Amino acid sequence: EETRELQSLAAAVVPSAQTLKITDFSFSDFELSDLETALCTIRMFTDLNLVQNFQMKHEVLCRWILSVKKNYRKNVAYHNWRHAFNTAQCMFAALKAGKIQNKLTDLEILALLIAALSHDLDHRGVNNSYLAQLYCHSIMEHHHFDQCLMILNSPGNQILSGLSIEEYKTTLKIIKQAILATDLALYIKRRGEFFELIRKNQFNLEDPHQKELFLAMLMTACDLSAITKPWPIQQRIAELVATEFFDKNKIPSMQVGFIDAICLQLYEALTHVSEDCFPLLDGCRKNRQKWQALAE
Ligand SMILES: CCCOc1ccc(C(=O)CN2CCN(C)CC2)cc1-c1nc(C(C)C)c(Br)c(=O)[nH]1
Ligand SMILES: [Mg+2]
Numbered sequence: 001e002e003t004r005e006l007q008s009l010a011a012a013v014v015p016s017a018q019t020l021k022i023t024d025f026s027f028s029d030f031e032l033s034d035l036e037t038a039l040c041t042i043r044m045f046t047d048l049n050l051v052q053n054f055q056m057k058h059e060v061l062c063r064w065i066l067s068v069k070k071n072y073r074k075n076v077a078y079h080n081w082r083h084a085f086n087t088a089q090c091m092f093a094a095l096k097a098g099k100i101q102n103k104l105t106d107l108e109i110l111a112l113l114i115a116a117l118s119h120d121l122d123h124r125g126v127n128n129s130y131l132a133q134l135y136c137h138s139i140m141e142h143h144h145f146d147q148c149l150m151i152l153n154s155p156g157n158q159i160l161s162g163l164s165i166e167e168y169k170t171t172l173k174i175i176k177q178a179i180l181a182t183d184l185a186l187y188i189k190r191r192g193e194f195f196e197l198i199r200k201n202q203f204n205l206e207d208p209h210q211k212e213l214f215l216a217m218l219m220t221a222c223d224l225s226a227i228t229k230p231w232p233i234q235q236r237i238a239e240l241v242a243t244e245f246f247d248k249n250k251i252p253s254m255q256v257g258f259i260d261a262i263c264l265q266l267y268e269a270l271t272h273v274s275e276d277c278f279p280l281l282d283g284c285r286k287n288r289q290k291w292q293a294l295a296e
């Protein structure tokens with residue numbers, strides 16, 4: 001059943017980015033099979049020039065995508081492969097349609113796409129604590145990175161084998177920071193600086209410190225990007241979140257609070273960095289109006 005999936009995936013035609021709607025901010029996966037999401041993932045790698053620039057063999061990338069998909073848990077309502085897949089599509093869309101791609105290096109883009117796909121690996125649900133104890137420091141995100149690394153090191157799955165050891169180490173580090181950044185605690189701590197810098201037109205991507213901060217903010221933006229979706233889609237994703245959160249009348253005001261506290265300023269900030277990411281902010285504002293109206 002596994003080689004069959006690999007055989008079938010490796011033998012399929014990969015449709016264009018246009019055919020697959022993968023450049024749209026309003027993209028939805030509900031109508032896609034797992035196979036189809038795997039094909040969209042290949043297309044994302046190829047059209048970001050990653051397959052070319054890093055000499056990835058087709059069967060290795062296919063196997064890697066399948067390993068990643070398999071290491072999410074289907075029984076988890078929201079934090080599963082479709083969430084990761086959606087997070088990466090949003091990354092792809094921000095890079096392409098959002099014109100973020102030109103601001104970054106090839107290695108940065110490679111790391112971000114891998115991070116996006118890998119950032120919740122082996123997640124067991126927000127209400128699960130499976131522990132050995134010992135608090136935070138982003139323990140879950142460290143686990144996700146560890147799972148990402150293990151897959152990258154797996155026989156037949158080494159899509160980074162084409163990089164030199166120096167490139168490899170640099171990219172692993174970007175991937176690690178990128179995944180660690182999806183800890184909402186780290187986002188809240190590092191937020192203010194990002195907003196402060198933009199507030200004064202002080203923001204500059206050339207400074208390595210600010211580049212790294214931006215990559216962190218970008219990860220969170222894609223991670224949360226379901227609340228930017230067209231209303232019929234957001235309503236449905238919110239169903240999944242609600243299901244995992246309690247594995248419904250207070251939900252509208254929760255969503256408004258979430259949007260106000262965490263989402264709005266982020267998407268406003270992103271749109272400042274790049275005008276073309278505006279549809280994310282527009283979508284987020286549109287969902288605030290819908291949720292608020294429900295809250296009465
Ligand atoms: C849909 C069912 C209810 O979901 C939520 C409920 C509450 C929250 C909050 O963050 C609420 N608190 C309340 C206190 N406040 C300062 C704002 C933050 C987020 C969510 C939420 N989290 C997420 C992600 C972080 C998983 C998404 Br995506 C989402 O659409 N909603
Ligand atoms: Mg996470």
Ligand SMILES: [Zn+2]
Pocket residue numbers: 083087119120182223
């Ligand atoms: Zn996530």
